[PDB]
Amino acid sequence: LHKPDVVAAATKILDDHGIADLTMRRLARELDVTPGALYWHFANKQELLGAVADHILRTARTDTADLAWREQIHESCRALRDALLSHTDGAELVSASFASGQSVVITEIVEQLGRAARAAGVSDADVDAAARTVIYYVLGFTVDEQSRLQWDADGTRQFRFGLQLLVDGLAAHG
Amino acid sequence: QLHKPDVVAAATKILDDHGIADLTMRRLARELDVTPGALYWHFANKQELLGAVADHILRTARTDTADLAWREQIHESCRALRDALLSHTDGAELVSASFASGQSVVITEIVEQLGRAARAAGVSDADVDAAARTVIYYVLGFTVDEQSRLQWDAVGALGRDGTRQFRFGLQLLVDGLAAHG
């Protein structure tokens, strides 16, 4: 069992069936393996969801070297939301993995947002809080949006507006 | 006969005791010791039931802020909202999903109330609703994340000045709104 195959099969369960069906027992069945084989790669569901979040966020990683802080926030957040919207229940999966401490990639995006907050003038003690505030808004926005798209079956402009409130807010620390 | 207030209350107790996943129409009927069909006289489906439970949870969240300056209105409303969500197991998640499905009347009222503060701040009428939703999305993302962490940590499955962190994000939003002044 190669870890990237496990992750890619877990991501297809999510896409085809939703976050609820993404369980270790179900993944084992789709890979045609004894379930114990999966616990060589993930100690539990929360690590599995973390690896799937890191995989769907591979395209959320964005180089904001050579962008001023305002533009880095906008771009980081654009790429994050696009990645989340690219998979069924993507925003919900990333929210859970952020809350569990199990996504490496979301933590990197936090640190990048924190470098932008720092450049705007936020004190070092508050940088993390500032970065997280942006993330909460993005996740809240996108969970809501996805859930409406999935059920009821200018988004970008609304998304950008709310982000701009935050950027104007950060700029009040200068 | 079944009194709708009693049904909502029973549904809220299942939520508190067992979590959002266990709040189903079949479980609710079992806890009330009634035939399941009786609940369908009060709610057509689980989303309507969750909506009523959301409005019940958010009963305490509404406060009259008319006497306050717009900044303090946003602070007062959002604190009351977070506190109501934290008062019930999975409350922030349940209110999120009900806002998204359009089934909570109280959250719609809170958003309109926040739109009045945005308008004092100088946000244009065309953007007041986006401004108000922006604040809500922050409060919901913050509080879903906070409550997941607290719930996991209480079962030692996680491996913190909530309030000060909450206030700091609210203040960024307020300062961003004021930038429209």
> How many domains, in total, are found in chain A?
1
Torsion of CA A70, A76, A78, A79, to 10 degrees: 160
Chain A residues touching B142 at Cβ < 8 A: 133, 136, 140
Query: Residue B98 in contact with residue B108, Cβ under 8 Å?
Result: no
Give, rounded to a whole angstrom, the gap between the first and last alpha carbons of chain A.
52
* PDB resolution in Å: 1.9
Query: Residue B166 in contact with residue B82, Cβ under 8 Å?
Result: yes
Q: How far, in Å, CA of A120 to CA of A168, rounded?
A: 10
Chain A residues touching B151 at Cβ < 8 A: none
How far is the alpha carbon of B2 from chain A, nearest alpha carbon, in Å? Answer: 30
How far is the alpha carbon of B53 from chain A, nearest alpha carbon, in Å? Answer: 19
> For chain A, percent helix, then strand, then coil, each to nearest 5?
75, 0, 25
Rg for chain B, CA atoms, rounded: 18
Query: Residue A75 in contact with residue A134, Cβ under 8 Å?
Result: no
| 3-class SS of residue B92 | helix
Query: Residue A135 in contact with residue A114, Cβ under 8 Å?
Result: no
**Whether B165 and A132 lie within 8 Å, measured CB to CB:** yes
Q: How far, in Å, CA of B168 to CA of A98, rounded?
A: 19
Q: How far, in Å, CA of A106 to CA of A49, rounded?
A: 13
Q: Exposure string (b/e) for A13-38, b if CB count within 10 Å is 16 or more? A: bbeeeebeebebebbbeebeeeeeeb
**Whether A137 and B137 lie within 8 Å, measured CB to CB:** yes
Q: Pick from A133, A141, A149, A173 the residue to mutate for testing the B interface (most B CBs within 10 Å).
A: A133
* B-chain residue closest to A130, CA distance: B169
* Residue A111 CB coordination number (10 Å): 12
Residue A137 token pair? 């808004």
Q: How far, in Å, CA of B99 to CA of B132, rounded?
A: 13
* Residue A105 CB coordination number (10 Å): 21
Chain A residues touching B122 at Cβ < 8 A: none
Range of the domain at B126: 1-181
Chain B residues touching A138 at Cβ < 8 A: 141
**Geometric angle at alpha carbon A59, from A23 and A117, rounded to 5°:** 105
Chain A residues touching B132 at Cβ < 8 A: none
Query: Residue B131 in contact with residue B147, Cβ under 8 Å?
Result: no
B137 touches chain A (CB under 8 A): yes
**Whether B138 and A138 lie within 8 Å, measured CB to CB:** no
**Whether A165 and B158 lie within 8 Å, measured CB to CB:** no
Residue with tokens 């470098």: A115
Identity (one letter) of the amino acid at B118? A
Q: How many helices (H) and strands (E) does chain A have?
A: 8, 0
Q: How far, in Å, CA of A119 to CA of A69, rounded?
A: 6
* Residue B34 CB coordination number (10 Å): 15
Nearest residue, CB atoms, A95 vs list B99, B145, B177:
B145
Q: How far, in Å, CA of B101 to CA of B99, rounded?
A: 6
